[PDB]
Amino acid sequence: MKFLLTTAQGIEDIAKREVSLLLKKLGISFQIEEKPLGIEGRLLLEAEKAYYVDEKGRKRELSISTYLNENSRLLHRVIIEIASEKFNGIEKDESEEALKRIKDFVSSLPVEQFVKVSETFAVRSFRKGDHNITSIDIARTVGEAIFERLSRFGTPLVNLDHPAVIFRAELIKDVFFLGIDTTGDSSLHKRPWRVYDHPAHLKASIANAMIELAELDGGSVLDPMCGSGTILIELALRRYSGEIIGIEKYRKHLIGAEMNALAAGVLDKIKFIQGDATQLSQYVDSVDFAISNLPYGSMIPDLYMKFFNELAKVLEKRGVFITTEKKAIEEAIAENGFEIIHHRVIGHGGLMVHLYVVKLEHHH
């Protein structure tokens, strides 16, 4: 079976690693390709089917997609792949021609093998790039092609709202994909604990990426500009053994973080402090790790300069930070005795953000 596994652009490798460890626990053979056909935010998983012997002494199949939906913290969607292909030049094609290519391609796929045509279906589409067609166009054409093909085998019923089966069709640049979305209408990053919605909140998948990149070892973890508490809540939900501390400047957001942490059942796991990170050394003397989604915003250069001056007084091991302001953070890091030991770019809410892992230059 082939699966398309989606995640944030720029963390594909971290997601592959998580999925690999999860599947290794099942005992199955598998291969994972990062960025199939060049497309960011995707993995292509090729796995053996997961068989066991059930209470009747019969071979029975375990659902790989349910296992991954239930256990992954880095993935957005788990989609059973029907087909992925390059439609070379489709960005330039006129509307009529582009849709024709898509309809003809889909008409050729054995979709009747991925739905009991008693079941209701709908088509969800996603489009990204410069096309002469829209999401709506794609969903209609694909929807038409699948209804027509299914009608060759039975009587198919659409249900747009509560389909039993969602076919997801995505066109990103030159690349077309069709699959069965096992995840459903809410992506895996939607957390039911998020009762307070901070307007610059970090998606949970990227929070977990930052945690993985810190390489935590049970030492104390501070988010000194914590907002609604996402990073610390995801960490407590990992049953982290170590101390967890959040500091946030504005009351409203700090109370939002408390409410989110209560909703998640981990309020007892986190110390939440209202405070100023440019004064960090007043609130703590020593922390092992700092992990923060910094404000993206002048005033930024000076906020970062003072914060990294204070962080230098208290940090023992590593910091992991995300920001849009590459130049401000890079200067604050260099002026304050820090060294960058990893950098990458991540796609977050249609922004390119920069992630850095840092340590103090003098620590060996």
Task: Tell me the binding residues.
Answer: 198-202, 228-230, 248, 276-277, 293
- What are 320's strand-pairing partners? 291, 357
Q: Give CA separation, 168 vs 25, 46, 123, 267, in Å.
A: 28, 19, 6, 37
Question: HEC profile for 241-269?
Answer: CCCEEEEECCHHHHHHHHHHHHHCCCHHH
Nearer to ligand SAM, 122 or 225 (CB): 225
CB count in 10 Å sphere of residue 254: 21
CB of 195 to ligand SAM, least distance (A): 12
Residue recorded with tokens 């209560």: 262
DSSP result, 14-53: HHHHHHHHHHHHHT--EEEEESGGG-TTEEEEEE--EEEE
Nearer to ligand SAM, 6 or 228 (CB): 228
CB of 276 to ligand SAM, least distance (A): 5
Binding site, annotated residues for S-adenosyl-L-methionine: 198-202, 228-230, 248, 276-277, 293
Nearest to 143 by CA among 162, 124, 126, 170: 124
Nearer to ligand SAM, 78 or 303 (CB): 303
CB of 52 to ligand SAM, least distance (A): 39
CB of 262 to ligand SAM, least distance (A): 15
Nearer to ligand SAM, 133 or 232 (CB): 232
Nearer to ligand SAM, 36 or 275 (CB): 275
- What are 46's strand-pairing partners? 2, 31
CB of 106 to ligand SAM, least distance (A): 39
Q: What is the spatial distance between Cα 174 and Cα 289, in angstroms, rounded to a whole number?
A: 42
Residue recorded with tokens 């923060």: 292
* Residue 316 structure tokens: 């023992």
**Are 245 and 271 a contacting pair, CB within 8 Å?**
yes
Q: What is the spatial distance between Cα 264 and Cα 219, in angstroms, rounded to a whole number?
A: 22
Name the DSSP letter for residue 221. E
CB of 11 to ligand SAM, least distance (A): 15
CB of 202 to ligand SAM, least distance (A): 4
Nearer to ligand SAM, 44 or 202 (CB): 202
Nearer to ligand SAM, 220 or 323 (CB): 323
CB of 16 to ligand SAM, least distance (A): 24
Nearer to ligand SAM, 202 or 235 (CB): 202
* Residue 154 structure tokens: 């039975």
Nearest to 75 by CA among 64, 84, 86: 64
Cβ-proximal residue to ligand SAM, closest one: 227
Q: What is the spatial distance between Cα 22 and Cα 2, in angstroms, rounded to a whole number?
A: 16
E strand or H helix at 213: helix 204-214
List residues near ligand SAM by CB under 6 A. Answer: 198, 200-202, 225, 227-228, 230-231, 247-250, 253, 276-278, 293, 295, 303
